[PDB]
Amino acid sequence: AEVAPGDVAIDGQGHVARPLTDAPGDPVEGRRLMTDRSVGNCIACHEVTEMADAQFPGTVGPSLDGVAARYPEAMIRGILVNSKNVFPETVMPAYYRVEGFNRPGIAFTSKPIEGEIRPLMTAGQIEDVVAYLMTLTQ
């Protein structure tokens, strides 16, 4: 049972204390999803050293080493729901938004989205990635 994009409860620091799904998040799958450019495409901006097989991580975002020792779960999930709530004017994409874009296209096809905008990541995929991020206590 998911919490849809528009229904997420987000406090004044951008945090989301409630999981987007009841499906507990799979750290393993999470790991995977962050390297897939089709989904999260995280290591384009982020290093994760624990992802030793990573291969050419970007340096646009800070290294994600130890992010579970500095931010609580609810802030980490907030960052994935809508990074802008936590980091105003951030270049980090908003991964569970579906409104307010400017010329959004279907993937990298260049064609306009007609109809429902889907989130960059599903509830499951976000929960999977957060589950993972929470293992980075270093």
Binding site: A44, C45, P57, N102, R103, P104, F108, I117
Partner: protein
């Protein structure tokens, strides 16, 4: 290296670092050629025309420049003379306001206007190989010369439209040209070392697709990769944006055809 000199064929000094144009001094200290973000091996490929695969197309365009084409039975050279003279300095100052059009026009638009209305020849696809080879020939004969696009006068409202597009986030990734190229140049997105997104080196010959790449083709690709819908090639929006990005490299040498990743 980022601070090594770029000299082409041993004769052509390329200014690859320059003081920020006044309209942009606000945002960084220096403007830099995209050449200065490439690896040594890659930088090497532009230091000499026998190694720059982009120059193969330029030589083919040198032939086309002299080929009568269209119903008028004329070739470019028939009106413009030898290309190294008739196009001397010209890439430095486009996109510019063209009185006969009442608009800022691109080099590509001017070429096609000559093709259909003076040569009686079919238009070339705006980002196709014919047009990009020719634009690269035109560029190549001005290499060394400081890019100097007017940003005021009758160009001004185009320049500002281009400027607003440059700072608008697009796509479901919600990113602007400046998101990547102004805030984060010198960082890495994955394998790519982020430049300031200058176009002083276009058409670029890229190792990725082993062909010349036209300005509007990169623009399209760039918006596409915000997961967004790019404007049309030749559109007034990209004409606007091109004028604008061009002015972001005022003072840098004309460099095209350049070699990039």
């Amino acid at each position: 290296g980022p601070d090594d000199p770029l000299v082409i064929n041993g004769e052509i000094e390329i200014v690859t670092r320059a003081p920020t144009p006044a309209h942009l001094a606000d945002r960084f200290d220096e403007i830099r050629s995209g050449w200065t973000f490439r690896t040594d091996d890659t930088q090497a490929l532009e230091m000499d025309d026998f190694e720059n695969s982009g120059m193969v197309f330029v030589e083919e365009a040198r032939a086309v420049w002299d080929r009568p084409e269209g119903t008028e039975g004329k070739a470019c050279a028939d009106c413009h003379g030898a290309v190294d003279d008739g196009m001397y300095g010209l890439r430095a100052v486009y996109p510019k306001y063209v009185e006969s059009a009442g608009k800022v026009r691109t080099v590509e638009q001017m070429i096609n206007a000559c093709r259909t209305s003076r040569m009686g020849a079919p238009e070339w696809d705006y980002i196709g190989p014919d047009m990009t080879a020719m634009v690269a020939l035109i560029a190549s004969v001005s290499r060394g010369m400081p890019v100097s696009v007017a940003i005021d006068g009758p160009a001004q409202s185009t320049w500002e439209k281009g400027r607003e597009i440059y700072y608008t986030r697009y796509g479901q990734l919600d990113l602007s040209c400046a998101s990547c190229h102004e805030q984060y140049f010198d960082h890495y997105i994955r394998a790519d070392h982020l430049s300031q997104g200058q176009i002083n080196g276009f058409p670029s010959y890229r190792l990725k697709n082993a062909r010349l790449n036209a300005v509007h083709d990169r623009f399209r690709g760039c918006i596409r990769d915000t997961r967004g819908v790019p404007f049309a090639v030749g559109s007034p929006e990209f004409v606007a944006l091109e004028l604008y990005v061009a002015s972001r490299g005022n003072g840098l040498s004309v460099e095209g055809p350049s070699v990039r990743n």
